[PDB]
Design an enzyme around this catalytic site. Structure first.
Site, PDB file in Angstrom:
ATOM      1  N   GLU A 138       8.991  12.076   0.383  1.00 51.43           N
ATOM      2  CA  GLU A 138       7.619  12.540   0.333  1.00 51.43           C
ATOM      3  C   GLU A 138       7.424  13.718   1.264  1.00 51.43           C
ATOM      4  OE1 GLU A 138       4.946   8.885   0.339  1.00 51.43           O
ATOM      5  OE2 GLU A 138       4.855   9.881  -1.636  1.00 51.43           O
TER       6      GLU A 138
ATOM      7  N   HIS B 166       8.394  -0.096   2.537  1.00 49.17           N
ATOM      8  CA  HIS B 166       8.704   0.281   1.153  1.00 49.17           C
ATOM      9  C   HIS B 166       9.365   1.635   1.174  1.00 49.17           C
ATOM     10  CE1 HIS B 166       4.782   2.152   1.991  1.00 49.17           C
ATOM     11  NE2 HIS B 166       5.338   3.171   1.311  1.00 49.17           N
TER      12      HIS B 166
ATOM     13  N   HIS C  55       9.087   3.965   4.505  1.00 48.40           N
ATOM     14  CA  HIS C  55       7.842   3.846   5.273  1.00 48.40           C
ATOM     15  C   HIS C  55       7.718   2.431   5.795  1.00 48.40           C
ATOM     16  CE1 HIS C  55       6.038   7.361   2.871  1.00 48.40           C
ATOM     17  NE2 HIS C  55       6.812   7.792   3.906  1.00 48.40           N
TER      18      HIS C  55
ATOM     19  N   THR D 138      -0.259   7.928   1.056  1.00 48.10           N
ATOM     20  CA  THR D 138       0.260   8.869   0.055  1.00 48.10           C
ATOM     21  C   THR D 138       0.087   8.354  -1.359  1.00 48.10           C
ATOM     22  OG1 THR D 138       2.486   8.055   0.104  1.00 48.10           O
ATOM     23  CG2 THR D 138       1.955   9.797   1.693  1.00 48.10           C
ATOM     24  N   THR D 139      -0.584   7.197  -1.510  1.00 51.49           N
ATOM     25  CA  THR D 139      -0.947   6.671  -2.807  1.00 51.49           C
ATOM     26  C   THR D 139      -2.428   6.428  -2.773  1.00 51.49           C
ATOM     27  OG1 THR D 139      -0.671   4.351  -2.048  1.00 51.49           O
ATOM     28  CG2 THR D 139       1.220   5.438  -3.047  1.00 51.49           C
TER      29      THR D 139
ATOM     30  N   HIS E  41      10.325   5.503  -1.193  1.00 55.04           N
ATOM     31  CA  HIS E  41       9.989   6.493  -2.229  1.00 55.04           C
ATOM     32  C   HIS E  41      11.286   7.198  -2.582  1.00 55.04           C
ATOM     33  CE1 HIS E  41       5.612   6.225  -1.378  1.00 55.04           C
ATOM     34  NE2 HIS E  41       6.025   5.910  -0.131  1.00 55.04           N
TER      35      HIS E  41
HETATM   36  C1  LIG Z   1      -0.484  -1.382   3.772  1.00 53.06           C
HETATM   37  C2  LIG Z   1      -1.805  -0.634   4.031  1.00 53.06           C
HETATM   38  C3  LIG Z   1      -2.444   0.265   2.907  1.00 53.06           C
HETATM   39  C4  LIG Z   1      -2.804  -0.622   1.728  1.00 53.06           C
HETATM   40  C5  LIG Z   1      -4.019  -1.498   1.922  1.00 53.06           C
HETATM   41  C6  LIG Z   1      -4.172  -2.715   0.975  1.00 53.06           C
HETATM   42  C7  LIG Z   1      -3.218  -3.872   1.239  1.00 53.06           C
HETATM   43  C8  LIG Z   1      -3.105   0.294   0.488  1.00 53.06           C
HETATM   44  C9  LIG Z   1      -1.971   1.243   0.141  1.00 53.06           C
HETATM   45  N1  LIG Z   1      -0.732   0.627  -0.213  1.00 53.06           N
HETATM   46  C10 LIG Z   1      -0.669  -0.635  -0.967  1.00 53.06           C
HETATM   47  C11 LIG Z   1      -0.720  -0.295  -2.455  1.00 53.06           C
HETATM   48  S1  LIG Z   1       0.799   0.455  -2.943  1.00 53.06           S
HETATM   49  O1  LIG Z   1       0.634   1.229  -4.136  1.00 53.06           O
HETATM   50  O2  LIG Z   1       1.826  -0.585  -2.940  1.00 53.06           O
HETATM   51  C12 LIG Z   1       1.114   1.556  -1.563  1.00 53.06           C
HETATM   52  C13 LIG Z   1       2.165   2.420  -1.645  1.00 53.06           C
HETATM   53  F1  LIG Z   1       2.939   2.395  -2.755  1.00 53.06           F
HETATM   54  C14 LIG Z   1       2.409   3.365  -0.681  1.00 53.06           C
HETATM   55  F2  LIG Z   1       3.466   4.167  -0.944  1.00 53.06           F
HETATM   56  C15 LIG Z   1       1.677   3.453   0.425  1.00 53.06           C
HETATM   57  S2  LIG Z   1       1.925   4.601   1.793  1.00 53.06           S
HETATM   58  N2  LIG Z   1       3.064   5.593   1.380  1.00 53.06           N
HETATM   59  O3  LIG Z   1       2.307   3.794   2.925  1.00 53.06           O
HETATM   60  O4  LIG Z   1       0.668   5.286   1.880  1.00 53.06           O
HETATM   61  C16 LIG Z   1       0.697   2.482   0.595  1.00 53.06           C
HETATM   62  F3  LIG Z   1      -0.027   2.451   1.740  1.00 53.06           F
HETATM   63  C17 LIG Z   1       0.348   1.540  -0.339  1.00 53.06           C
HETATM   64 ZN   LIG Z   2       4.937   5.128   1.383  1.00 57.70          ZN
END
Ligand SMILES: CCCC(CCC)CCN1CCS(=O)(=O)c2c(F)c(F)c(S(N)(=O)=O)c(F)c21
Ligand SMILES: [Zn+2]
Ligand SMILES: CCCC(CCC)CCN1CCS(=O)(=O)c2c(F)c(F)c(S(N)(=O)=O)c(F)c21
Ligand SMILES: [Zn+2]
Lengths: 257, 257
Positions: free
Chosen positions: A100, A87, A113, A192-193, A89
């Site tokens: 970020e 994904h 990321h 970061t979320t 940012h």
């Molecule tokens: C994929 C492993 C971590 C998951 C575990 C559950 C599936 C929870 C967090 N996750 C999913 C929810 S989210 O809001 O789509 C989202 C996000 F937007 C991010 F930017 C980041 S980041 N920047 O990688 O921390 C995330 F990691 C992240």
């Molecule tokens: Zn991210």
């Protein structure tokens, strides 16, 4: 939770205690906290060349737009970590400065990321997430048109709203990585979320990639955090967290100069 | 509340809801700047304090110097009378602890001279949650030549090393702490940078920094604790600055072009 207003990042810790805990990301990368570490040898990217005849699910979940990745995609040089999703940012059309991580106090235009989980130890990323995770970060600069990133961006007008999904044909994900991937910053941090779990081994590549002004503008205008029928729409913009105190951490570099 | 661990800045909004509200400070001052010819020079009246005594305190969050209400800024719509001054700094391993940043860069430290609208309100506590309540002058500090004027404060720091301790400082000319060309400043409406984070501060951040020596900066960074003398777990008073806040669709006005 949001990135703006009474549910924004200063309030995440009210519902998500780890967001107020230790080891938070992102951080500012600057000289005083960097230290060369000769043990940081090159990662190997395994199974990143996804078949163009297969397709991979892109989803807007309201907080993010993510591309699901197959577990046969891995990084080694660490346990073996398997990919789960990528994904981005970004900022907004009037301020395209939404990375970020920052470098010597400056934001890049955006940041990619690629999230991985330890598939040696855990059966999926959700499980791993509170143990577990390795995220590769690519800093993105406004510059030339990037055909490889466009393989994702050309589908965003099809996942504009929360809950929408689209398929993206496979492509070689290593095309998203910058020059000299052997050169990176490495540190222990967090998601970061929310839920901000302090379970991430971060690798931020030294060198940025470029995408064009037009690509950034499309990215910054295509997406909403809200459902297609929501009477109070919210644009998916400025979806980056401010940098965090460094809580006595150093960042280790695979490059000495 | 603290600047670290689980009671640090991401958790302030639990007990202090304005810390998660609008108009939060500090911010990055980057070329969001717009010249405003309305921004005429302030005049610092009553700053030449009678060589009277003024109380220096460590309250566990900050070391402040109390100031008398006959000291005031002239040039704002109302008179703003002084109440106290204090500083913010980093730590010896990362000596970059200003609150405001300029083009993403921290200065070594930052001095704040807090004033309240004494035309409208009887004291700073009452003013602090009210419209037009507060005005803070901010001086950016960088390491360079020894500064005899700042030493009029710093020479007392050993006597207020621990929370609850107090020392008497003989009056001196507080204008000596201001930089060159005080006509040149940044101006914006923001908040307290500590709890309760009230969005009631008219900020004036001078354009030009002052210098203190490497030894003075180290003294500031090493002299003080945030704990009582008898606390079996002492905590150094370091990194007592808030991270910058998002500041979107807004200008900072400058008195200079
Ligand atoms: C994929 C492993 C971590 C998951 C575990 C559950 C599936 C929870 C967090 N996750 C999913 C929810 S989210 O809001 O789509 C989202 C996000 F937007 C991010 F930017 C980041 S980041 N920047 O990688 O921390 C995330 F990691 C992240
Ligand atoms: Zn991210
Ligand atoms: C002085 C008018 C505001 C007072 C009203 C009650 C007397 C509450 C806050 N106040 C007193 C508590 S404190 O922790 O010593 C402290 C502080 F450390 C600061 F850095 C700032 S500032 N200037 O926001 O950076 C403060 F303003 C401040
Ligand atoms: Zn202050």
């Amino acid at each position: 939770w949001t990135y703006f207003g009474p549910d924004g990042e200063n309030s995440w810790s009210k519902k998500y205690p780890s967001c107020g805990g230790l080891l938070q990301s992102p951080i500012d990368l600057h000289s005083d906290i960097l230290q060369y570490d000769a043990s940081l040898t090159p990662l190997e990217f395994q199974g990143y060349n996804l078949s163009a005849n297969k397709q991979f699910l892109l989803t807007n979940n309201g907080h993010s737009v993510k591309l699901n990745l197959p577990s046969d995609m891995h990084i080694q040089g660490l346990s073996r970590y398997s990919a789960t999703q990528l994904h981005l940012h970004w900022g907004n059309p009037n301020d395209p400065h939404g990375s970020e991580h920052t470098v010597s106090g400056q934001h890049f235009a955006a940041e990619l990321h690629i999230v991985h989980y330890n598939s040696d130890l855990y059966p999926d990323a959700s499980t791993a997430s509170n143990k577990g995770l390795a995220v590769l970060a690519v800093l993105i600069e406004m510059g030339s048109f990037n055909p490889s990133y466009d393989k994702i961006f050309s589908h965003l007008q099809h996942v504009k709203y929360k809950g929408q999904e689209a398929f993206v044909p496979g492509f070689n994900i290593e095309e998203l990585l910058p020059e000299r991937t052997a050169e990176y910053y490495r540190y222990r941090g967090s998601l970061t979320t929310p839920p901000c779990n302090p379970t991430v081994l971060w690798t931020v590549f030294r060198n940025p990639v470029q995408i064009s002004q037009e690509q950034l503008l499309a990215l910054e205008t295509a997406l909403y955090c809200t459902h297609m029928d929501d009477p109070s729409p919210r644009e998916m913009i400025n979806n980056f967290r401010q940098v965090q105190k460094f809580d006595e951490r150093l960042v280790y570099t695979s490059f000495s100069q």
